[PDB]
Amino acid sequence: MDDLERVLYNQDDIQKRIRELAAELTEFYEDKNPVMICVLTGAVFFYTDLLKHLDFQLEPDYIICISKDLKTNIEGRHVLVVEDIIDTGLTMYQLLNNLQMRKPASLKVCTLCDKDIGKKAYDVPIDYCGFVVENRYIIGYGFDFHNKYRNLPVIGILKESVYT
Amino acid sequence: MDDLERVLYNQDDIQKRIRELAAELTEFYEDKNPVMICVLTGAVFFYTDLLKHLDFQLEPDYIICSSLTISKDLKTNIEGRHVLVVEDIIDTGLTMYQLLNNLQMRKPASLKVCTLCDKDIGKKAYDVPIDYCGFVVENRYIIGYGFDFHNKYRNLPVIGILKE
Numbered sequence: 001m002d003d004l005e006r007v008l009y010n011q012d013d014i015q016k017r018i019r020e021l022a023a024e025l026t027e028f029y030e031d032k033n034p035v036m037i038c039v040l041t042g043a044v045f046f047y048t049d050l051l052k053h054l055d056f057q058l059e060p061d062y063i064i065c066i067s068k069d070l071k072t073n074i075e076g077r078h079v080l081v082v083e084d085i086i087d088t089g090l091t092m093y094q095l096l097n098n099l100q101m102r103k104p105a106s107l108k109v110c111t112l113c114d115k116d117i118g119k120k121a122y123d124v125p126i127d128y129c130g131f132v133v134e135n136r137y138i139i140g141y142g143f144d145f146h147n148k149y150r151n152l153p154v155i156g157i158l159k160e161s162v163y164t
Numbered sequence: 165m166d167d168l169e170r171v172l173y174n175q176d177d178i179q180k181r182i183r184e185l186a187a188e189l190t191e192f193y194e195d196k197n198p199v200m201i202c203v204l205t206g207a208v209f210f211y212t213d214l215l216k217h218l219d220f221q222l223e224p225d226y227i228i229c230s231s232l233t234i235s236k237d238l239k240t241n242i243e244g245r246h247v248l249v250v251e252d253i254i255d256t257g258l259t260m261y262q263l264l265n266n267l268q269m270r271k272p273a274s275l276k277v278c279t280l281c282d283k284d285i286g287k288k289a290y291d292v293p294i295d296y297c298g299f300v301v302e303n304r305y306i307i308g309y310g311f312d313f314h315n316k317y318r319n320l321p322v323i324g325i326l327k328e
């Protein structure tokens with residue numbers, strides 16, 4: 001907590017936003033038996049918290065980028081990619097391009113955070129976004145620094161003095 | 165929720181147990197920088213909830229397997245590392261017995277098992293050492309809190325029995 005510069009969002013903020021996102025996703029996916037792709041290892045906290053509010057049939061899958069590909073054939077499937085944060089958009093840009101060639105019925109992105117770096121280098125459509133954050137080192141709620149801080153029940157900023 | 169024959173443990177029971185387990189784990193793993201392996205997908209809810217209570221440096225890793233086919237192997241070289249396997253439920257013990265044999269060959273410094281549930285089926289086919297266990301469950305099909313049936317029921321905030 002001493003290494004934390006300031007808190008951007010508290011646990012109450014986080015849970016309220018997750019419930020809102022879940023309701024929005026339910027509106028579109030409830031009837032679609034979507035493949036909900038979790039981008040390991042960063043998106044896990046967000047992913048499970050979302051799944052705790054999705055009261056319908058869905059098929060989990062995981063990807064690491066490809067090091068680990070998808071176990072499900074996504075052709076003709078409604079697919080949702082769950083990500084922790086989008087910075088420049090490079091990874092997502094290439095991810096979507098790859099996945100789009102597999103011919104899914106639909107493909108959308110849901111990210112916990114979108115880093116405000118102004119105009120991103122890659123034009124990535126973000127359909128669902130939890131929060132827009134400052135261009136700083138984000139820490140807490142799954143975000144780590146040297147495998148530390150993931151347990152903090154907030155989304156905050158790491159002091160520069162800690163990593164520089 | 166109407167497909168539940170009955171609830172075995174509510175969210176309050178689960179959360180209390182997780183805090184107890186986290187305290188127990190900290191005792192041993194605090195200064196060990198362990199590799200905490202989550203056996204996806206069922207164990208993911210339990211896994212992330214535990215990690216929210218672990219206030220020390222640790223390295224997450226994930227494995228996807230079934231009894232033994234490993235669809236997604238570890239990213240981490242566990243040679244000389246302290247390793248904890250986080251599982252959802254141990255039934256006959258076959259899956260964990262094979263997983264442990266595979267992991268022990270990689271030469272970890274230590275290797276322990278943490279399971280959310282242990283299904284009481286009497287003498288198991290394999291004598292799997294369980295170091296940490298959340299609850300002993302009866303010989304029925306368990307549903308909820310990560311446990312699914314045909315890709316349904318994971319979101320339930322309780323651990324319960326699937327109706328016949």
Ligand SMILES: Nc1nc2c(ncn2[C@@H]2O[C@H](COP(=O)(O)O)[C@@H](O)[C@H]2O)c(=O)[nH]1
Pocket residue numbers: 206231252253254255256257258259260283304305306307311312313
């Ligand atoms: N959802 C759910 N999965 C179960 C149940 N019992 C065992 N499994 C799954 O079967 C495996 C354990 O079986 P074992 O190899 O011990 O017989 C684990 O993958 C576990 O998740 C149950 O009652 N409910």
